[PDB]
Design a protein around this ligand. Structure first.
Ligand SMILES: CCCCCCCCCCCCCCCCCC(=O)OC[C@H](COP(=O)(O)O)OC(=O)CCCCCCCCCCCCCCCCC
Ligand SMILES: CCCCCCCCCCCCCCCCCC(=O)OC[C@H](COP(=O)(O)O)OC(=O)CCCCCCCCCCCCCCCCC
Ligand SMILES: CC(C)CCC[C@@H](C)[C@H]1CC[C@H]2[C@@H]3CC=C4C[C@@H](OC(=O)CCC(=O)O)CC[C@]4(C)[C@H]3CC[C@]12C
Ligand SMILES: CC(C)CCC[C@@H](C)[C@H]1CC[C@H]2[C@@H]3CC=C4C[C@@H](OC(=O)CCC(=O)O)CC[C@]4(C)[C@H]3CC[C@]12C
Ligand SMILES: CCCCCc1ccc(/C=C/C(=O)Nc2ccccc2C(=O)O)cc1
Ligand SMILES: CCCCCc1ccc(/C=C/C(=O)Nc2ccccc2C(=O)O)cc1
Lengths: 527, 527
């Protein structure tokens, strides 16, 4: 009787696997098209992540057994989508983070951070949101998340150990600041450069109206307002809304934080002179970031364009090649260089010191499930283009002409920021942007009024682990749930739409003259 | 004085990394072309595998940092070569081998094999060479090596434990029989079907001279002679040439083998009735092989052509899709199905049984280095086509016309079997075969006399771990060296050439009429 409601709650992860793909079978049966077959696979994988029925890397293997056997794409063509260039940037970025962790260099950094900032929950999070968003303005968002996530994990382990929901608030703040901060520069992310392509290709006489100096004046105050509104929402949701326990003001919080800071000062006064392994890894860490800043900056000419150019003039060497090249070097350098030890067998001959990385410790400490989880996001987005789901949704934005013009920028921002959680940012932008230019010419509206919110809203990807590859790197240590990401990222999409709709109707109107319909957007069909 | 020769022998793995890429710099400097830049990367990676200076998966990351920064191919195009379709067949094939190993089913199979064959070294190896070569005639060579290598490893662990150089002789015999046995049928391997394409496309009036019934009559006696000559060479090299210790004849070998067989009979009489986890995995193992036999057989119509066809008529579902689909199912089925246990925290609610596979045991027992080692072989072969190294070597076979005709089949077989150790079998065959047809028409020679040894010699890949993806699967357990493979595979290439040159000059002459220059190979330029 009452034992039936006990057992079925224990079997809740086996009842979802058996009853979710049956309850969605009205979709690929009643509307038999190739677009409905791709929408079935998107809802299915999004429901297996929130309920956590399967492991995260097992659900990412579902495009390998769905897209062939419903006719979307061949099996050999869906297989080469799983190890792209951004997978190797996560691979080589975590080869450095393993050698930092193994030689106790993460205990040196996490004690030097907490001596500067201090044991306070909320100013420590804002200290990590500012450095991550500042770094993401100049390098790729995957290179920032692969570097800052193992550092933010070592600070939390040194905070909790020295004190005897904060670990989810700090893992999400590095995920979100790497995506929010990338929109303040023209070369910050990838869909920002597509808008400069589609403006110079659609309207060839614009006179360079979208350059580095005018995009920065429009999108940098949007980044700062969206950052401080994301810090307030992440603090209210996961930490309390007390706003005095968070900053630690008053008594009974100054008694603990003096007793927590005096442990950190003692723990830092031990672990004295640095070893040879810490001196060689910290030098290789500065060289790795200095080669990321100056590889292809865009506003001057880096070493990736002087040496190694292609026919067009861009770089054949990406950010992943610099990360693999440094991680290979760590297999070569000895760890204790004059370390002639003795071997137990054949006493005889001597033994060599191990390198800064050996394969035995790389095989243990590597998050191999994230490499598959990131690869399952590309195959889910590639099958969305090969079926025609992006083209079908793009041809539904056209009858939105009979809405007043300030409300076309809001409805379009919601539809792009929802749809970009499934697909890629670069492929959504190059499809939608020719459609919105032809729609703006028909209702005597200026372009870059429906194209500028369409470019900024592809970077508001805050819910699912397949959009914005920063979203999957934060699951490398298993202290999160995918429900906890979707619980914080839903209202952050609606906050981010109301900020973009503020920046396009105030301080976006004078520096672009959005009230004129200028003389480079005419055609033979307008007037 | 004498301590200098002690220390430098200990540092032998750091002196090779520093002095091999300096001693080969005369190649990319003196002959500055794009073909010499690709030959430099091939010799470099082949020298780091034999001397074992770096780990096997680290050397496979070298096309990611070589081919971009010497102009061969872009970094984003060399990155999507590392997870192809045959990587996922090794992945899903080892998901089943982990669940077999974890639930002690490998102890049931390894005791049932040794009760049938018996503790004798040399007839046990021939028992594994026959079943592997028979299975490889009907399915892909990667699916046979992914299934038979964990079974042959469990027999050796049960042989050595029940007895108190054989472990290298048995790992290589499953590697070589999966490649040798695949040439006896037309649909056995991939370059065999390319010859039926290039014959029907070059000479359209051949009258179907290469079909299933005539290829089998020519290439099946070649497979059996090459198999028994490979069993004799592997036994002489690794085991002794005593030929009575191997078969175990005489006294002092019948005293041990009766005392070794009586341990196996006792060890098998324990481990009684099978559990639920052994009954569900053994049924999923028969269904996996039954779906591999009948997917796309070629001589009748499988389920891959009836259901899921493409526009041409072939299958959109490959052997990798069947292996992933079974390995996903093992995450769903419970292991002890009415297993309502108790949880220590909240005594209260109950707990669910784990599946047949959980991610904690997959993350430990998976050979993740072989997935990278197999991917480094495709990127090394793809960069050989994008530079033009295969085209350059193909245009050097043309001036071989002024050699007597039985010696053109031997020289060409040596040059293909050497060059195929670096590149792929399918891409070497589709480049070389149009060149040899045009060379055969100019010296009044029959085709399929220089094309039939060119098709059979792309399957004699026995030295390096990048050719024939069976060659990299045998390193999954680390009991081999790459030098031990190259020490057995060098003379097996010269043995395999002298067998092909026997089958093309005896019993290859009457059933193809190779002495006639028939009426379908004429042109406007011949006579
Ligand atoms: C404002 C909050 C900032 C929080 C910053 C969090 C992110 C830190 C990223 C660290 C990146 C490290 C790159 C590699 C470094 C290699 C060198 C190395 O390890 O040397 C040993 C060094 C410790 O040397 P030792 O003291 O001799 O043991 O360890 C370090 O990693 C150095 C500390 C790095 C982080 C410092 C961040 C300071 C930001 C200050 C911003 C302004 C604060 C204003 C408010 C306070 C005013 C007083
Ligand atoms: C000739 C040498 C043959 C050597 C064969 C080596 C390769 C064996 C491949 C085994 C593939 C197993 C697929 C999955 C099986 C699931 C079922 C299962 O495990 O059932 C429990 C079963 C044991 O059941 P139990 O006895 O109740 O514990 O275990 C097995 O896996 C069955 C044994 C499989 C291998 C048998 C090979 C026999 C070949 C005979 C060829 C002719 C020999 C001529 C000379 C001797 C004459 C007397
Ligand atoms: C539940 C787990 C353990 C296994 C996988 C179940 C689902 C995730 C997928 C895998 C195979 C899928 C099926 C693969 C192919 C088809 C055929 C498809 O219809 C056609 O292809 C009709 C013919 C055509 O128009 O081409 C309708 C959906 C369906 C049944 C799919 C329904 C959803 C299925 C069962
Ligand atoms: C030894 C490990 C620790 C680091 C890597 C060393 C070698 C494996 C590779 C990596 C980079 C390679 C270099 C990359 C580029 C070039 C330029 C190349 O010449 C040109 O490209 C000339 C200009 C042109 O014609 O395009 C000659 C080889 C060289 C020096 C390569 C020599 C071999 C190098 C040093
Ligand atoms: C299928 C993919 C989507 C998953 C379903 C889903 C899950 C969560 C949410 C967002 C809930 C939320 O934002 N709730 C709150 C609001 C205001 C204050 C506190 C909360 C709170 O939940 O704590 C939306 C949708
Ligand atoms: C750079 C890639 C090639 C590696 C170099 C290389 C390594 C090994 C060999 C083959 C040696 C061999 O076959 N030797 C023997 C012959 C007859 C009986 C016993 C042996 C024996 O070595 O035990 C050839 C070349």
């Amino acid at each position: 009787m009452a034992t039936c409601w006990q057992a079925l709650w224990a079997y809740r992860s086996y009842l979802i696997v058996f009853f979710v793909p049956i309850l969605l079978l009205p979709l690929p049966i009643l509307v038999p098209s190739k677009e409905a077959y791709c929408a079935y696979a998107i809802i299915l994988m999004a429901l297996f992540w929130c309920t956590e029925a399967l492991p995260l890397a097992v659900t990412a293997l579902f495009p390998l057994i769905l897209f062939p056997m419903m006719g979307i794409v061949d099996a050999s063509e869906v297989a080469v989508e799983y190890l792209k260039d951004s997978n190797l940037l996560f691979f080589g970025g975590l080869l450095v983070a393993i050698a930092v962790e193994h030689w106790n260099l993460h205990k040196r950094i996490a004690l030097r951070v907490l001596l500067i900032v201090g044991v306070r929950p909320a100013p420590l999070i804002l200290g990590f949101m500012l450095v991550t968003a500042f770094l993401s303005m100049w390098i790729s968002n995957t290179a920032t998340s692969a570097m800052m996530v193992p550092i933010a994990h070592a600070v939390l382990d040194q905070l909790h150990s020295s004190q005897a929901h904060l670990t989810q608030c700090m893992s999400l703040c590095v995920c979100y600041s790497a995506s929010i901060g990338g929109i303040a520069t023209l070369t910050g992310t990838a869909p920002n450069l597509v808008l400069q392509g589609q403006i110079n290709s659609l309207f060839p006489q614009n006179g360079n109206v979208v350059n580095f100096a005018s995009w920065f004046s429009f999108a940098f105050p949007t980044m700062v307002i969206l950052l401080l509104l994301a810090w307030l929402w992440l603090q209210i949701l996961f930490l309390g809304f007390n706003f005095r326990k968070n900053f630690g003001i008053g008594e009974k919080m100054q008694e603990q934080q003096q007793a927590a800071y005096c442990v950190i000062q003692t723990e830092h006064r031990l672990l004295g002179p640095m070893t040879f392994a810490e001196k060689a890894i910290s030098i290789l860490f500065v060289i790795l970031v200095l080669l990321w800043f100056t590889r292809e900056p865009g506003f001057f000419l880096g070493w990736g364009n002087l040496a190694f150019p292609n026919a067009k003039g861009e770089s054949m060497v990406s950010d992943g090649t610099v990360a693999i090249f440094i991680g290979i070097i760590m297999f070569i350098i000895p760890s204790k260089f004059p370390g002639l030890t003795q071997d137990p067998e054949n006493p005889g001959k001597l033994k060599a010191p191990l390198g800064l990385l050996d394969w035995k410790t790389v095989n243990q400490k590597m998050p191999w499930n994230i490499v598959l989880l990131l690869g399952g996001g590309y195959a889910l987005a590639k099958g969305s283009e090969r079926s025609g789901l992006s083209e079908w949704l793009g041809n539904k934005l056209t009858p939105l002409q009979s809405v007043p013009a300030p409300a076309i920028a809001i409805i379009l921002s919601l539809l792009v920021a929802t749809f970009t959680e499934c697909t890629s940012n670069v492929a959504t932008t190059t499809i939608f942007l020719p459609i919105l230019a032809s729609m703006a010419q028909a209702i005597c509206l200026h372009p870059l009024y429906v194209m500028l919110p369409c470019t900024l809203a592809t970077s508001l990807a805050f819910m699912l682990p397949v959009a914005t590859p920063p979203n999957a790197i934060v699951f490398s240590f298993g202290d999160l749930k995918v429900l906890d990401m979707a619980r914080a990222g839903f209202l952050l999409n609606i906050i981010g739409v109301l900020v973009i709709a503020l920046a396009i109707n105030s301080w976006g109107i004078p520096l672009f003259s959005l009230h004129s319909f200028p003389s480079w957007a005419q055609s033979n069909t307008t007037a």
